[PDB]
Amino acid sequence: RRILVVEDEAPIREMVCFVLEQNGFQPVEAEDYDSAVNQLNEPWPDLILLDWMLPGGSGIQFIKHLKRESMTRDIPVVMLTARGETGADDYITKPFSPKELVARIKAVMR
Ligand SMILES: [Mg+2]
After folding, report:
1. Looking at the domain covering 1-110, what would its CATH class be?
2. ∠ Cα 109 76 62 (to 5°)
3. Which purpose does this protein serve, as stated in its record?
4. Domain map of the chain by residue range?
């Protein structure tokens, strides 16, 4: 079960990848906007966890890029936001607990 993790702060991205990994998913990492776009190919993300801001582009822009093609327009998008309208299907605040993330990712998968 493949989850694209778009997140520029490496320890957070690595934290998120470990939770998913230990929980039975196949996580894919992207450190910035460009790298995320180049992760939009076979094999395809079943859900995207999307950080709100990245080097080279925002989460709002990436969601627009997703909604522009039929292959990506349907992929679930959970926006990762920090504390302190958008097209995402759901949102989760940083820091979040590992059980919150999994439970959330599953409620969204459907
Ligand atoms: Mg960021």
Report:
1. alpha beta
2. 160
3. This protein is a positive regulator for the phosphate regulon. Transcription of this operon is positively regulated by PhoB and PhoR when phosphate is limited.
4. 1-110
